[PDB]
């Protein structure tokens, strides 16, 4: 079919919790074979790897290439270009990319369980809503006490774009279902959001049975001495 | 490319708030032989209508057939079988579609805005969560007071599948941002969910300020 070239950004999880900054250049529309040649603008330690072909939709071949060890330029603000040349071509294809600009730090809100869920006393839902960040990629994890729960315990949605009241932004939500006894005993749950805009790439919001609303608190202030030669 | 026949159930939106119902049987991966005869065994009521082939997979002329007016048979429990033939082989292709049982209603929760939002005197966020419904189709809308809102004002996510062990169920969420002045004035807001399993196919939840448990403090200053 129609040949095309594209570039895939490094996965967010690998960048945040990894050390291999692999950037992949993908080529489609192979005709009968794969005799393509790939190259990049930089070559200092560019251990480019092609690999065996694969199967495309409708029946077709597509061989991609990878470039690891580029984390430092990626964070410093470099631009990466991949150019490919296939035998049945007269002009090599090209693709270019760079780190996204105009990034907005997410706003994280942990909403306590709905008041109706705490009366049936079977399970309760904690909602973590991250709102208002420019790039799409984001991560959501959970902690009970200090130990993270397995990722097969909760449900996270894809990052989507929200209505515009100004500039463009995105949003994501996650939910955890936990035993009511754990909540009413006094355990604390934390939601961790991982985004490139945040200062240390991660932030957390904690919640327990008492936080999030006063609901008849009892506060005591003593103010022991007030005329005592304050020097 | 590669022959393939698929059946699509009627869309929930039309089934709920509409009148006509679409019933789609589509063939893909031919790239030729536009004279494909889409024959439905339950040829009752209306008549099948063909459609011009469309470029699919950049190498196929996908051809689909619609059987409108079958909303009542679809709701009654009549199974629909689509039969078609292709010149590549002498074996006709037949596919079946029917309604599934074990339907569970959704649980809808509307959550007030976080306490850290009211300090900025900007919009405030209200979240609606529908959870636990077996069929993977649902539609969520919003109201401010009595006047509905356009679809270009709130965001909703796709109905994903939740990590349970007992039975398969799905969840969906949406958020609406409203003016702080409207929230503080006393105007109420609501989120409505529509799903097959509900007896009336529509429910909603309502939120307004100064609702719920009191939140006043009791301080004791001693001064020794």
């Amino acid at each position: 079919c129609h040949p095309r070239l594209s570039l895939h950004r490094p996965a967010l999880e690998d960048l945040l919790l990894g050390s291999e900054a692999n950037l992949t250049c993908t080529l489609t529309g192979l005709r009968d074979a794969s005799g393509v040649t790939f190259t990049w603008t930089p070559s200092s330690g560019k251990s480019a790897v092609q690999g065996p072909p694969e199967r495309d939709l409708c029946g077709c071949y597509s061989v991609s290439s990878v470039l690891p060890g580029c984390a430092e330029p990626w964070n410093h603000g470099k631009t990466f270009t991949c150019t490919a040349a296939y035998p049945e071509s007269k002009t090599p294809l090209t693709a270019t990319l760079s780190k996204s600009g105009n990034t907005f730090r997410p706003e994280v809100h942990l909403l306590p369980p709905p008041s109706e869920e705490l009366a049936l006393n079977e399970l309760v839902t904690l909602t973590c809503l991250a709102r208002g960040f420019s790039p799409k990629d984001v991560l959501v994890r959970w902690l009970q006490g200090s130990q993270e729960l397995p990722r097969e315990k909760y449900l996270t949605w894809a990052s989507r774009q929200e209505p515009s009241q100004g500039t463009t932004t995105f949003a994501v939500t996650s939910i955890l279902r936990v035993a009511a006894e754990d909540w009413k005993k006094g355990d604390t749950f934390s939601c961790m959001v991982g985004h490139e805009a945040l200062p240390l790439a991660f932030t957390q919001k904690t919640i327990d049975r008492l936080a999030g609303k006063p609901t008849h608190v009892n506060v005591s202030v003593v103010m022991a001495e007030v005329d005592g030669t304050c020097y | 490319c590669h022959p393939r026949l698929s059946l699509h159930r009627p869309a929930l939106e039309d089934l709920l708030l509409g009148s006509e119902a679409n019933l789609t049987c589509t063939l893909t991966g031919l790239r030729d032989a536009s004279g494909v005869t889409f024959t439905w065994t339950p040829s009752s009521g209306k008549s099948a209508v063909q459609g011009p082939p469309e470029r699919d997979l950049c190498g196929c002329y996908s051809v689909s057939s619609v059987l409108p007016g079958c909303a009542e048979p679809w709701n009654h429990g009549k199974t629909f079988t689509c039969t078609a033939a292709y010149p590549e082989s002498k074996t006709p292709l037949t596919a079946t579609l029917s309604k599934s049982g074990n339907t569970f209603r959704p649980e809808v929760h509307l959550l007030p805005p976080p306490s850290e939002e009211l300090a900025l005197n900007e919009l405030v966020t209200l979240t609606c969560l529908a959870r636990g419904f077996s069929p993977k189709d649902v539609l969520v809308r919003w109201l401010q007071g009595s006047q509905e809102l356009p679809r270009e004002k709130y965001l909703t996510w796709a109905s994903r599948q939740e990590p349970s062990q007992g039975t398969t169920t799905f969840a969906v969420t949406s958020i609406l941002r409203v003016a702080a002045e409207d929230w503080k004035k006393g105007d109420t807001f609501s989120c409505m969910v529509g799903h097959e399993a509900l007896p009336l196919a529509f429910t909603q939840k309502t939120i307004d300020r100064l609702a719920g448990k009191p939140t006043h403090v009791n301080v004791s200053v001693v001064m020794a």
Partner: peptide
């Protein structure tokens, strides 16, 4: 006279009753 106003009134009454029962359940614990 419209139905919607009466339905809204009934909804508000039921919501307030639900809140009161919510308070009563919690106060028992």
């Amino acid at each position: 006279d419209p139905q919607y106003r009466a339905l809204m009134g009934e909804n508000q009454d039921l919501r307030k009753r639900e809140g009161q029962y919510q308070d009563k359940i919690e106060e028992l614990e």
